[PDB]
Amino acid sequence: MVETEPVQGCRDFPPEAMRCRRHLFDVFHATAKTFGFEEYDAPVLESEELYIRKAGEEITEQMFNFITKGGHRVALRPEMTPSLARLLLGKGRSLLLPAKWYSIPQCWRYEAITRRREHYQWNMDIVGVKSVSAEVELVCAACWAMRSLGLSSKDVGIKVNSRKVLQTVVEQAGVTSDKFAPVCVIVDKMEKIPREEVEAQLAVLGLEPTVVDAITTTLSLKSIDEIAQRVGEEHEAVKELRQFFEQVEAYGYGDWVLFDASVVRGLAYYTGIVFEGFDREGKFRALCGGGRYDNLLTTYGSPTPIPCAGFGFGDCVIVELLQEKRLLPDIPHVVDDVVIPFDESMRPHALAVLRRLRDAGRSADIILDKKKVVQAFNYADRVGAVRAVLVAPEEWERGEVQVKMLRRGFAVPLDRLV
Amino acid sequence: MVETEPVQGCRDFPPEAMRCRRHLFDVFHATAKTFGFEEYDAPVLESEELYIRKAGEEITEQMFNFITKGGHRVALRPEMTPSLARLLLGKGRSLLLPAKWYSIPQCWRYEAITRRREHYQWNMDIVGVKSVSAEVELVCAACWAMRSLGLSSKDVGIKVNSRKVLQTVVEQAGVTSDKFAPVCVIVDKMEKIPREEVEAQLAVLGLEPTVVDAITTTLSLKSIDEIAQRVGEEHEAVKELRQFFEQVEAYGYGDWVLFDASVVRGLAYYTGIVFEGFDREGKFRALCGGGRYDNLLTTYGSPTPIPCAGFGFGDCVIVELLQEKRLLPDIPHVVDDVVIPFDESMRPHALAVLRRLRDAGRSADIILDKKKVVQAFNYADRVGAVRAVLVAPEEWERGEVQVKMLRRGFAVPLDRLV
Ligand SMILES: *CCC(=O)Nc1cnc2ccccc2c1
Ligand SMILES: *CCC(=O)Nc1cnc2ccccc2c1
Ligand SMILES: N[C@@H](Cc1c[nH]c[nH+]1)C(=O)O
Numbered sequence: 001m002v003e004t005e006p007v008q009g010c011r012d013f014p015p016e017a018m019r020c021r022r023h024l025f026d027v028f029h030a031t032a033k034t035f036g037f038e039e040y041d042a043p044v045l046e047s048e049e050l051y052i053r054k055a056g057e058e059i060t061e062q063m064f065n066f067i068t069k070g071g072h073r074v075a076l077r078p079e080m081t082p083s084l085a086r087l088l089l090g091k092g093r094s095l096l097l098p099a100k101w102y103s104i105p106q107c108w109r110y111e112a113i114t115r116r117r118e119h120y121q122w123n124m125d126i127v128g129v130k131s132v133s134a135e136v137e138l139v140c141a142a143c144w145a146m147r148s149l150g151l152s153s154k155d156v157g158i159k160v161n162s163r164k165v166l167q168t169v170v171e172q173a174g175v176t177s178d179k180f181a182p183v184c185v186i187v188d189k190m191e192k193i194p195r196e197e198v199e200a201q202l203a204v205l206g207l208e209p210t211v212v213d214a215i216t217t218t219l220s221l222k223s224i225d226e227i228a229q230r231v232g233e234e235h236e237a238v239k240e241l242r243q244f245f246e247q248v249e250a251y252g253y254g255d256w257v258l259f260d261a262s263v264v265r266g267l268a269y270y271t272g273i274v275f276e277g278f279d280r281e282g283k284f285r286a287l288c289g290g291g292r293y294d295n296l297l298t299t300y301g302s303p304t305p306i307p308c309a310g311f312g313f314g315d316c317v318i319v320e321l322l323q324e325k326r327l328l329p330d331i332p333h334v335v336d337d338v339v340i341p342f343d344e345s346m347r348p349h350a351l352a353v354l355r356r357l358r359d360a361g362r363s364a365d366i367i368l369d370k371k372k373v374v375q376a377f378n379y380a381d382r383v384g385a386v387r388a389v390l391v392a393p394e395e396w397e398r399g400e401v402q403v404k405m406l407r408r409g410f411a412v413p414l415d416r417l418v
Numbered sequence: 419m420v421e422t423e424p425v426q427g428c429r430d431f432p433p434e435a436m437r438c439r440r441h442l443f444d445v446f447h448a449t450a451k452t453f454g455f456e457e458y459d460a461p462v463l464e465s466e467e468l469y470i471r472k473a474g475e476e477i478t479e480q481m482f483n484f485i486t487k488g489g490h491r492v493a494l495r496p497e498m499t500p501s502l503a504r505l506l507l508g509k510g511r512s513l514l515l516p517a518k519w520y521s522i523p524q525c526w527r528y529e530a531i532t533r534r535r536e537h538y539q540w541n542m543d544i545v546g547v548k549s550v551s552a553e554v555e556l557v558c559a560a561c562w563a564m565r566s567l568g569l570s571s572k573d574v575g576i577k578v579n580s581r582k583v584l585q586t587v588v589e590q591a592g593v594t595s596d597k598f599a600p601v602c603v604i605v606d607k608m609e610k611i612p613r614e615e616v617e618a619q620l621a622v623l624g625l626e627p628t629v630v631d632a633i634t635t636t637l638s639l640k641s642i643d644e645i646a647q648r649v650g651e652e653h654e655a656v657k658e659l660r661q662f663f664e665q666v667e668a669y670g671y672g673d674w675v676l677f678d679a680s681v682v683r684g685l686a687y688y689t690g691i692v693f694e695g696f697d698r699e700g701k702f703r704a705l706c707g708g709g710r711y712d713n714l715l716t717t718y719g720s721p722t723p724i725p726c727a728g729f730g731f732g733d734c735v736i737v738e739l740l741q742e743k744r745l746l747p748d749i750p751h752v753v754d755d756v757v758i759p760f761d762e763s764m765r766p767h768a769l770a771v772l773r774r775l776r777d778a779g780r781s782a783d784i785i786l787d788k789k790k791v792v793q794a795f796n797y798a799d800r801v802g803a804v805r806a807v808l809v810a811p812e813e814w815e816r817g818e819v820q821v822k823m824l825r826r827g828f829a830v831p832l833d834r835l836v
């Protein structure tokens with residue numbers, strides 16, 4: 001007896017579960033199409049060199065990696081953004097900007113807590129757009145998908161902030177910019193852990209209380225006005241946030257978005273606006289997350305800087321949420337027609353009827369093994385047949401077949417079936 | 419400058435290539451729906467124990483495997499069928515038969531020839547059907563997909579045979595059935611390599627010339643009648659083949675299928691009918707391949723035998739074929755509308771028009787960065803916009819917007835856009 005359970009921390013998708021998965025993914029695809037993005041994909045396997053960012057990120061701590069027999073260090077992608085940029089660099093100047101690329105890759109992490117080791121992540125990125133109009137498009141896409149699954153501005157939101165704010169606090173206070181990204185990582189873990197633990201974890205990177213307290217204060221500012229008092233309306237993070245909120249208002253999604261100076265995200269490459277989907281009952285971790293990352297491509301060796309922004313939207317939390325709101329009922333399998341031979345002698349004919357139904361775009365099954373009509377009808381019910389088509393010898397001589405709608409069973413000519 | 423090329427032997431799918439991939443996969447999905455199959459999926463990662471079959475198969479010689487840090491021996495699936503059976507066993511008696519399951523998994527092999535290490539394989543299996551009516555359904559599905567891509571009975575075919583034929587030759591000649599599966603593996607490599615090399619490779623497994631010559635002769639029989647002379651019409655492989663050909667005839671695909679006693683397939687678990695898609699110009703390797711495998715589930719420790727049959731249909735050869743026949747032209751990207759602000763002051767309004775178009779199911783982009791109208795029109799062309807919608811201040815005061823079909827530019831009220 002072989003092991004039926006899957007590999008540690010992975011998921012099987014038998015039909016029922018796969019229909020839930022499809023319900024979700026169809027939304028990601030439709031939203032992408034609505035917003036005008038183009039699909040792409042890259043190998044699940046990447047060179048390990050692609051991810052070592054030296055910022056102390058939780059994503060680079062828990063990487064599912066190994067060695068090919070041929071010696072090359074490779075990894076199951078923990079995320080898609082580095083792969084995207086690998087494609088964008090490959091294209092060079094034959095890349096046409098602006099580009100709006102999306103994908104639904106499965107991504108992989110490794111842990112000792114026997115926790116999931118995989119998830120599917122919708123990725124949406126806009127490449128080659130300087131202005132916050134891209135973030136606006138991105139957030140609006142996030143919200144569209146959410147409403148498409150049947151969530152409202154009363155159920156979820158999008159918290160927004162800009163790392164440029166903290167960028168200045170750290171620059172003015174006298175800390176070399178190399179220390180910045182690792183700080184964002186530490187400051188991102190604020191609600192999750194104590195306050196004295198963060199300040200000690202910051203102090204470890206060579207930062208005195210004056211410099212640390214400035215950081216504490218600026219995360220717990222509640223408005224843009226308060227950000228303005230702290231760094232002026234002159235500040236570009238302020239103009240960007242104002243423009244961002246103005247454009248999302250105009251698009252019609254003002255009720256979905258709000259400012260939150262605590263939001264930094266845990267990844268290193270974000271440089272400007274950042275955002276984080278959340279549920280309004282405070283029950284769940286983030287629904288999705290993204291931001292602007294203007295330097296990643298410079299860092300990958302692009303001769304000229306390429307502005308980007310995008311987000312990830314995982315398959316785990318959104319499902320947990322939809323399930324709580326009872327917006328993910330099991331959809332049962334359907335099929336238009338189940339062709340039923342009265343007996344084996346009728347099989348050849350039933351096969352020609354089966355041909356016609358399919359030829360006309362209908363979905364159809366035919367009873368495969370020898371079985372009684374009554375068992376065949378039971379089978380039709382089980383598989384969600386809208387209609388049973390009985391093929392009996394008597395009707396066949398007349399050029400007819402019996403048809404029963406499942407939601408007597410009337411005689412019908414061949415030609416009127418379709 | 420980071421490495422832009424992907425990992426050895428894998429493929430990137432930037433937008434253009436991904437549209438080809440989608441063209442193909444949409445066919446696999448539609449054919450599956452037409453034939454009434456249900457989608458499933460399992461982890462790309464499986465325990466290594468799942469594949470060691472001891473038959474000398476080329477698939478188990480070239481397996482892309484490695485060790486998790488946690489010690490477990492795991493592998494990137496070289497095929498889907500063992501994973502399917504893992505799911506089917508997990509379900510036990512809550513599995514409803516007959517079951518018609520399909521999937522489009524990426525599968526992985528390892529080689530020293532720096533050759534592809536991955537492909538996408540459409541898998542279609544019917545579970546819980548004793549009679550050849552399943553193989554009929556399977557082959558007909560194979561052909562449907564092929565015609566759906568625009569191939570004809572004049573371009574490709576399906577060669578059919580039954581391993582039960584060789585089963586008897588080997589049994590009558592006095593060879594323990596353990597030697598059978600390894601023979602099928604060797605006999606499958608017949609066209610690819612010399613004849614004396616196969617007979618020496620057979621002799622290595624403890625088989626004298628009398629027993630070997632029987633095998634040689636029975637592969638090069640050209641008709642079913644000749645199979646009948648050799649093993650009688652009594653024989654069930656003969657009744658099965660006759661029934662198979664009769665049912666495919668009746669379905670309307672007689673011209674696509676033909677008998678070929680050389681066909682055995684290279685995998686161990688096939689027990690009855692087997693089949694192999696081929697192109698009629700003799701140019702390419704197999705388009706797809708499948709068969710009946712009635713014992714795999716017994717072998718996996720099922721308390722009672724579960725009859726199955728199915729096939730694999732890869733993404734490599736079919737593409738090569740379609741490309742030769744010029745049936746895979748690059749489909750360029752489209753989008754319904756590109757909303758164009760006359761200038762930045764018009765952006766808020768353009769965003770509300772963008773809302774309306776999307777709200778109505780249209781796909782739409784909006785000019786994201788600051789740019790001239792003329793550049794905006796050039797952009798609209800590039801991305802396959804069917805229609806440009808210019809939003810100017812003069813028209814806006816009237817409650818109008820300018821609309822230009824891209825395959826003057828007339829004024830239109832907001833409400834008539836959609
Ligand atoms: C329920 C939340 C969850 O499973 N999240 C998750 C799973 N797997 C990965 C793999 C790689 C990166 C992130 C995640 C997140
Ligand atoms: C062009 C044919 C081809 O690439 N075939 C192929 C590629 N990759 C795999 C991986 C696993 C098993 C089979 C194949 C076949
Ligand atoms: N890869 C990021 C999401 C993202 C896409 N684009 C920018 N950020 C994440 O894992 O959260």
Ligand SMILES: N[C@@H](Cc1c[nH]c[nH+]1)C(=O)O
Pocket residue numbers: 497498499541542543685707708709711727728729730
């Ligand atoms: N897994 C088989 C195809 C198959 C599916 N079902 C039965 N056979 C192959 O790799 O060729």
